[PDB]
Structures are given as structure tokens and as C-alpha cells.
Design a protein around this ligand. Structure first.
Ligand SMILES: O[C@@H]1[C@@H](O)[C@H](O[C@@H]2CO[C@@H](O[C@@H]3CO[C@@H](O[C@@H]4CO[C@@H](O[C@@H]5CO[C@@H](O[C@@H]6CO[C@@H](O[C@@H]7CO[C@@H](O)[C@H](O)[C@H]7O)[C@H](O)[C@H]6O)[C@H](O)[C@H]5O)[C@H](O)[C@H]4O)[C@H](O)[C@H]3O)[C@H](O)[C@H]2O)OC[C@H]1O
Ligand SMILES: O=S(=O)(O)CCN1CCN(CCS(=O)(=O)O)CC1
Length: 339
């Protein structure tokens, strides 16, 4: 049965002078009394796990433009605002979780570059405009870099139609729609050096020519074995060298498995839970040295059975700070210790 402990130290309170501590949650958590109380106990930022992505906000199109469905997303923003916490908007532009009809006209034909850029402006103006003043940070563009490409750009439909200018224009238009939102470029695998370098140069070049980008989001979807905390620190050191860029750790989780491993556990091995705890302690000890630039650290889920990694890899995993029964893990105590 459920074993939440309402009296153990609050995560965000323990880091209140360092950075916000956030959590990604799906809509079901907003209507579950235990989930809601746990979110508000420990976190001073939330991200909608899926409900603010393009496929969630888009309802359809006609020959005059886009139709939207905002009711569920409104609940997330209202929940954050009424409870005096931040909400990170995730995410305006992404090759995933956007319907393919978004790249087509009302007769099924692929949009031209000019027509797609006009649609991008409409989408950003409508979505960012609706939530103007209420969303402190947006992931404006998610995962636009692919280090396997010689020029570093992911060959998504966005890129195939627009070339790389869709990225800078997304930031320009989001900043017009809400000039006080902090605008982030968000990505994973920042500890692959070639990818780090593409991300660094892209953001630095945008910034140096006056594009309104304010931050880099390091997703930090990691595991107990890789990458090292030192390599995460190397990413922070390089990205923080760009003037006017802050850093959010946006989607932190730590699988118990090596990547591509066929290990599959029914219950979490204690040795791996301890390795996880040690690494989370090391990670937060390092992040605390960089509070001049790291302003928010969000975990990609509330508790282990809610983790996207279970569906992603088709097996049980224990990547977060709370067990399935809401009780604290070794990792939780390690994060408190590091504070
Ligand atoms: O049915 C749907 C349902 O699908 C949907 O589900 C939601 C989907 O969105 C979820 O939210 C998103 C999750 O995170 C971001 O997107 C993903 C980020 O992760 C990408 O995958 C990453 C791939 O790289 C892995 O790292 C590897 C580690 O190993 C490295 O190699 C080392 C090298 O050194 C050696 O020594 C080591 O042995 C060796 O292992 C590799 O180089 C490196 O690649 C990462 O671990 C892994 O994370 C993934 O492709 C992205 O998609 C998004 O931003 C975020 O939105 C959401 O949570 C789900 O709920 O929900 C609705 C249903 O209707
Ligand atoms: O000790 S370690 O070697 O691990 C990292 C030391 N390093 C020195 C510079 N600061 C920022 C100074 S400031 O932004 O507050 O002025 C971040 C961390």
C-alpha cells in the first residue's frame, strides 16, 4: 500500500538558495490527491510530460489555419500559477509528437518553406500568446541537433522543408509573443563531445547575432554507468561560457541499466540502487558549484513506476527518487545529503 512520508525534507526547500527543483508530470497527477500533495511538497517547478507538446495542443487545421485544444494544458498552467510554482513549457518545436498533417496543407500536400514558416509563426504566437506571463521558461526547440550529420542538424521534416532557419525564427517569434519568458534550446546527449560542440556553436552563433535565446536545457537522461559527472560538468562549463545563457537540467533521470543492455530485473537490485544514490550525490554536489548558471533541475517523473523508461525500453526500471509506493529511495537521501 502507499507509503508517502509527508514529513521528510522537501527537495526544493533543501535547494532553495541554489536552484529550483522541478518534476515532469502527466495530467492524471493533477487529479490525484497523493500525487498533487507530493508534487507541491517537493517541487517548485513542473513540466507537463506530454500535455504541452504539439500533438496535444493541436486539434486540426482548415484552409485558414490551425485549430487548438487547450483545456488540459490550461489545467497545468493554472495549477502552477495558483500554487505559486513555475511551469516550464515543453515544447514548441520538435520532430517528435507533432502530427505529420502539421507539415501539409488542407489537401494533404507538403507545405512550401514559406507556408510552413508562416504556420510556425501562427502556432508560436497562438500558444505562447495564450500563456503570456504565466510560463516562466519555454523549451522553444527540442532535439534539433543530430551529430551523425556533417553539419549537425537533424534531418527532420522541419529541416527538410525550412533549412536551419526554423530554429532562429522560432526563438524570434516566441520572444515577440512573450518577451518575459526565458527561451531554451533543449537536448539530450550533451555529453557526446561532437554533439555538445554542435549545440554549443549553434546557440553561441544564434546569440551572437541577436537571436533571443536565453538558455540551454540539458535533458540529462543518463544511467548509473554513463556519462560521468565530470563529463556533465564539462558540458556546463562550455555552455556557461556563452554570455547571457543560463542552464536548466530539464529531464533528469538515471536508469539502472546500461544502454542497450539485455539485463531485465523484476525488483531493483540494491547494489544498483546504491550506485544510483552515489551518482546522484556526486551530480548534485557538482551542480551546487554552478548555481551562477544552473537555475533549475527538473526530474523526468515523480516516482519509478511513472517513468517513461518503462515503456521506452519495455522493462521495469527505477530511475527517480521515489519508489512505486511513494517512499524515499537511497537516491532521495543522497540528494538531500548533497544539499
Ligand atoms: O504512446 C505515447 C507515448 O509514446 C508517449 O510517451 C512520451 C514520450 O515522450 C516522453 O518525453 C520525452 C522523453 O525525453 C525526451 O526525448 C527522448 C530523450 O531520450 C532519447 O533517447 C536517448 C538516447 O541516448 C541514450 O544515451 C545513450 C547512453 O549510452 C551512450 O553510449 C555509451 C558510450 O560510452 C560507453 O562506454 C557506454 O557503454 C555506452 O552506453 C550512447 O551514446 C547514448 O546514446 C539516452 O539514455 C536516451 O535517453 C529519446 O530518443 C528521446 O525520445 C523528450 O524531450 C521528452 O519529451 C514522455 O516522458 C513519454 O510519456 O506518451 C503518450 C503516449 O500516447
Ligand atoms: O571547484 S570546481 O573545480 O569543481 C569548479 C569551480 N568553478 C569556478 C568558477 N565558478 C563560477 C564563479 S561565479 O560565476 O560565481 O562568479 C563555477 C565553478
Amino acid at each position: 500500500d502507499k507509503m508517502p512520508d509527508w514529513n521528510i525534507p522537501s527537495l526544493y526547500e533543501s535547494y532553495k538558495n541554489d536552484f529550483r527543483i522541478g518534476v515532469a508530470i502527466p495530467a492524471k497527477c493533477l487529479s490525484n490527491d497523493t500525487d498533487r500533495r507530493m508534487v507541491l511538497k517537493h517541487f517548485n517547478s513542473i513540466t507537463a510530460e506530454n500535455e504541452m507538446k504539439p500533438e496535444s495542443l493541436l486539434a486540426g487545421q482548415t484552409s485558414t489555419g490551425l485549430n487548438y485544444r487547450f483545456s488540459t494544458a490550461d489545467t497545468f498552467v493554472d495549477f502552477a500559477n495558483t500554487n505559486n510554482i513555475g511551469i516550464r513549457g515543453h515544447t514548441l518545436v520538435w520532430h517528435s509528437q507533432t502530427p505529420d498533417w502539421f507539415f501539409k496543407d488542407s489537401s494533404g500536400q507538403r507545405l512550401t518553406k514559406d507556408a510552413l514558416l508562416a504556420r510556425l509563426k501562427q502556432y508560436i504566437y497562438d500558444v505562447v500568446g495564450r500563456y503570456k506571463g504565466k510560463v516562466y521558461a519555454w523549451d522553444v526547440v527540442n532535439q534539433a541537433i543530430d551529430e551523425n550529420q556533417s553539419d549537425g542538424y537533424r534531418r527532420s521534416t522541419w529541416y527538410e522543408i525550412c533549412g536551419p532557419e526554423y530554429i532562429e525564427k522560432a526563438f524570434i517569434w516566441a520572444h515577440e509573443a512573450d518577451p518575459n519568458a526565458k527561451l531554451f534550446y533543449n537536448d539530450y546527449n550533451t555529453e557526446i563531445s561532437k554533439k555538445r560542440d554542435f549545440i554549443y556553436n549553434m546557440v553561441k552563433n544564434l546569440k551572437s547575432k541577436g537571436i533571443p535565446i536565453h538558455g540551454i536545457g540539458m535533458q540529462c537522461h543518463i544511467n548509473v554507468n554513463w556519462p560521468s559527472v565530470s563529463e556533465i560538468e564539462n558540458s556546463i562549463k562550455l555552455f556557461s561560457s556563452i554570455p547571457g545563457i543560463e542552464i536548466h537540467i530539464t529531464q533528469l533521470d538515471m536508469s539502472l541499466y546500461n544502454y542497450g543492455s539485455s539485463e531485465n530485473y523484476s525488483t531493483p537490485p540494491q547494489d544498483l540502487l546504491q550506485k544510483q544514490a552515489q551518482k546522484y550525490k556526486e551530480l548534485f554536489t557538482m551542480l551546487k558549484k554552478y548555481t551562477n548558471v544552473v537555475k533549475c533541475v527538473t526530474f523526468w517523473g515523480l516516482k519509478d513506476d511513472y517513468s517513461w523508461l518503462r515503456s521506452f525500453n519495455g522493462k521495469n526500471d527505477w530511475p527517480l527518487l521515489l519508489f512505486e509506493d511513494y517512499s524515499a529511495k537511497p537516491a532521495y537521501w543522497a540528494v538531500i545529503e548533497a544539499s
